[PDB]
Design a protein around this ligand. Sequence first.
Ligand code: DHT
Ligand code: DHT
Lengths: 277, 277
Amino acid sequence: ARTVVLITGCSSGIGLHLAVRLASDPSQSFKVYATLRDLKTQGRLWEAARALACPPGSLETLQLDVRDSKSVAAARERVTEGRVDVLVCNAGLGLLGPLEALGEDAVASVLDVNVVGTVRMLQAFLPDMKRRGSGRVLVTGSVGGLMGLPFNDVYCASKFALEGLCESLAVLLLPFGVHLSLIECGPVHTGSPEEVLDRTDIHTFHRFYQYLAHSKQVFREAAQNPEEVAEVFLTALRAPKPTLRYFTTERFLPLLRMRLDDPSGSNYVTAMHREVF
Amino acid sequence: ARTVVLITGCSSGIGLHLAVRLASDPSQSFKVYATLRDLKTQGRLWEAARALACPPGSLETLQLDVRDSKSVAAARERVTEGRVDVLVCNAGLGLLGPLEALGEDAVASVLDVNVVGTVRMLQAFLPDMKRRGSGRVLVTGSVGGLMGLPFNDVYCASKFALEGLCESLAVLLLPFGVHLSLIECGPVHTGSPEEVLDRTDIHTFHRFYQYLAHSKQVFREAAQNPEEVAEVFLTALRAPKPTLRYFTTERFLPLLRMRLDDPSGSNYVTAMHREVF
Ligand SMILES: C[C@]12CCC(=O)C[C@@H]1CC[C@@H]1[C@@H]2CC[C@]2(C)[C@@H](O)CC[C@@H]12
Ligand SMILES: C[C@]12CCC(=O)C[C@@H]1CC[C@@H]1[C@@H]2CC[C@]2(C)[C@@H](O)CC[C@@H]12
């Protein structure tokens, strides 16, 4: 009857706002499983759910740790309807800093949550979709998945990885009737200094500050409401033939095109260096 | 005096051929540390070294496991010259199959060797390069880093990740005088069926066969000599101002451009589906 949606990473941000947008939809078309790594963070989702007056039974929370394939399987068994019509792979971690200041565990964690975590969800959920010959997968992407950003080396690695993962899968899934799309987000309004200085050189440290200053100004001028981003997920959801990629904004497309039409990377690296520094 | 080169993944392929090309250079400009995960595989490198008559002391082998930051640090201490002029990040794993048939450990291993392994090398070696204000980093890339290939979902994820990692770093390293370049390789002439069938559906299994058939024909028609690929690394090495990206072939550039100029991904996914299936 209803469209069953399971969303990862609902404790804040896009995931939180998408979950309550869908559950509160005036048409009541959606049953939403909002999943979270730590149940102690669920308060914010329930406060938003109340604000939007989600009908009882339109929204349920599950604990799901995308690092643990047992946790993934336990949450899938909790989908009482026995299918997922829309899977939204949104859990993700950022990681910001000079590459040599990043702990090895932090690097592996970002990769595990952002890439392997999405692999675990797709392994768990794609089979029943392929069998039914139907289902929609939406994956939260980033501008940092489409072009490299300084001091985001590992975050960008992880978001570029989701691009390759999803594009590869889409080439195969086409004749199966299962549609996968990336939702490419720019900024969204959702170590300490001594720590970082201890792990890098003064010149890199200064470039980091410059990057942070520029980033803050891009964010204050350009950040989108998660309400507006969530509606782009909805657009993808309802598209009779969805495309592989949706963009939540036109903002970064000129930078992207400059990347796109000089494959040597020389124009992009130059332009981004000037843009930031 | 000599240009000190440390290359990862020298047991076969590009890494093996690049190592002996450099060590055997008639000019004797290069001292090469060819590194390998398992020393039992070093025979092939030494057979090639003899064939090309590398002078004694032009080539040394080190054991290096890019999964282990202690192994990385132990090999760096073995660079008797106390600097690395050229770091070649080439170790890599493939992974081929229906996504749901891939073991979780195999997925994590590919990511660890191909992405985190390269992060470990850059963390270990970039600091002294930035300090000197000089050094060249060359990273073995792939066509699968630039466009998604069906049944290579995790391999492509890993090779897309190297793109984001390197591009992000290049934006920063520009004013430091340290130059990083990807060398984008097409095919290079360097589970059992019951296993895979047990882990997927018959229809995906059949698409896998089709992909393998097409792949084999692309390889037989298009595979390059690693001798020819190694010379593209040399070109990058010697370029007074290197670009971010070198391509070893023009072959896949029409497919890439079609990807590049439809950001929605719709033309690429369609064209690649038709190309393979
Ligand atoms: C990381 C930031 C800033 C913080 C964030 O939420 C993600 C966002 C993605 C767009 C980036 C931006 C930093 C400034 C950049 C790099 C602009 O120059 C162009 C794209 C911007
Ligand atoms: C994985 C393969 C085949 C095996 C290999 O060594 C890597 C190589 C990269 C180019 C791929 C190719 C498979 C066939 C493809 C997908 C062609 O259609 C275009 C690019 C090709």
